[PDB]
Design an enzyme around this catalytic site. Structure first.
Site, short mmCIF file in Angstrom:
data_model
loop_
_atom_site.label_atom_id
_atom_site.label_comp_id
_atom_site.label_asym_id
_atom_site.label_seq_id
_atom_site.Cartn_x
_atom_site.Cartn_y
_atom_site.Cartn_z
N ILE A 146 10.73 2.17 -3.23
CA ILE A 146 9.40 1.97 -2.66
C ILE A 146 8.73 0.81 -3.38
CG2 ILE A 146 7.34 3.16 -1.81
CD1 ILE A 146 8.66 5.79 -2.82
N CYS A 147 8.07 -0.06 -2.61
CA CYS A 147 7.32 -1.20 -3.14
C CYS A 147 5.83 -0.88 -3.01
CB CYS A 147 7.68 -2.48 -2.40
SG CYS A 147 7.17 -4.01 -3.23
N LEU A 148 5.19 -0.59 -4.14
CA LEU A 148 3.78 -0.19 -4.17
C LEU A 148 2.90 -1.02 -5.09
CD1 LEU A 148 3.00 3.66 -4.00
CD2 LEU A 148 2.45 1.80 -2.43
N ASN A 152 8.70 -1.32 3.82
CA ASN A 152 8.52 -1.32 2.37
C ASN A 152 9.39 -0.28 1.67
OD1 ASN A 152 5.54 -2.01 3.64
ND2 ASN A 152 6.05 -3.29 1.87
N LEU A 158 0.74 4.03 2.36
CA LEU A 158 1.73 3.03 2.74
C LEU A 158 2.44 3.43 4.03
CD1 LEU A 158 3.21 0.40 1.93
CD2 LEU A 158 4.81 1.80 0.62
#
Lengths: 151, 77, 71
Positions: A88-90, A81, A113
């Site tokens: 960052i993919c959150l 991710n 994560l």
């Protein structure tokens, strides 16, 4: 008033972080701009990133906290991710951001994560593929990258 | 009402917020620092963008804008 | 010039350096200020680890802040 409305919140968050830091992460400005912070995150023990110190950069928008901050890794990390550019993919950093969400909560979410990655909905398809097909290989590679770049 | 809000970082770890104008002199900022924190102006050294801010010059002369952080050195005492 | 080294705990260490100084004798300069031996300190500037190049090539100026990591 320019972006002073955001600066009030940013200074308040900095004071809150300084008075009571999580002791597994840190954040604050290290340069000449209150909108640009450096953060550090200690790798979780239950993850292959244990023992690594990961550096991140935070860019606050001029109308914080109505718009989310731009948070990006600066230390190279092997994670499905987080791409090679540190993005960052959150899902709380551009889509479900709400006021009263603090930078500390963002750091805690990034730590979570790191603890438990997300194979589906990936940012790096190849690392996600390796993660789904071989867990030992992923953990070994992540440990090698943590030792090389975060230690 | 176009005042800019800047910050002064000390070695104690705190950040002092100051509402200033671009035409304010460096000595005026030092006087504000003395008023808020008590440090005498003649014992302050202000650094921004790797430059020692000389007296008589203004913040605008150093491209100090909203959200700028100036590092304060408490020396010669 | 004057540079500043911040630990993750927030404490500041001011050092009087010059751009000609490399970073290993800077590491040694941090050694005799709080007691950290050079073998257990990591110097980071702008998020990049510094390998014992000189201060000039990393563009370290007056007021620069460097993060110290106990590793």
């Amino acid at each position: 008033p320019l972006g002073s409305m955001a600066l009030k919140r940013i200074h308040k968050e900095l004071n809150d972080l300084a008075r009571d830091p999580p002791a597994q992460s840190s954040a604050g400005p290290v340069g000449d701009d209150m909108f640009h912070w450096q953060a550090t995150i200690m790798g979780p023990n239950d993850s292959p990133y244990q023992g690594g110190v990961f550096f991140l950069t935070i860019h606050f928008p001029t109308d914080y906290p109505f718009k989310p901050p731009k948070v990006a890794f600066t230390t190279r990390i092997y994670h499905p991710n987080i791409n090679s550019n540190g993005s960052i993919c959150l899902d709380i950093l551009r889509s479900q951001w709400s006021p009263a969400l603090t930078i500390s909560k963002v750091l805690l979410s990034i730590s979570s994560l790191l603890s438990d990655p997300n194979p589906d909905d990936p940012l790096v398809p190849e690392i996600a593929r390796i993660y789904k097909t071989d867990r030992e290989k992923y953990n070994r590679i992540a440990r090698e990258w943590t030792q090389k770049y975060a230690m | 009402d176009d005042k800019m809000h800047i910050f002064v970082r000390t070695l104690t770890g705190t950040y002092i917020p100051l509402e200033v104008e671009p035409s304010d002199t460096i000595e005026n900022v030092k006087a504000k620092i003395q008023d808020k924190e008590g440090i005498p102006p003649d014992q302050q050294r202000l650094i921004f963008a790797g430059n020692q801010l000389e007296d008589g010059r203004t913040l605008s002369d150093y491209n100090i804008k909203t959200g700028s952080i100036l590092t304060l050195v408490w020396s010669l005492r």
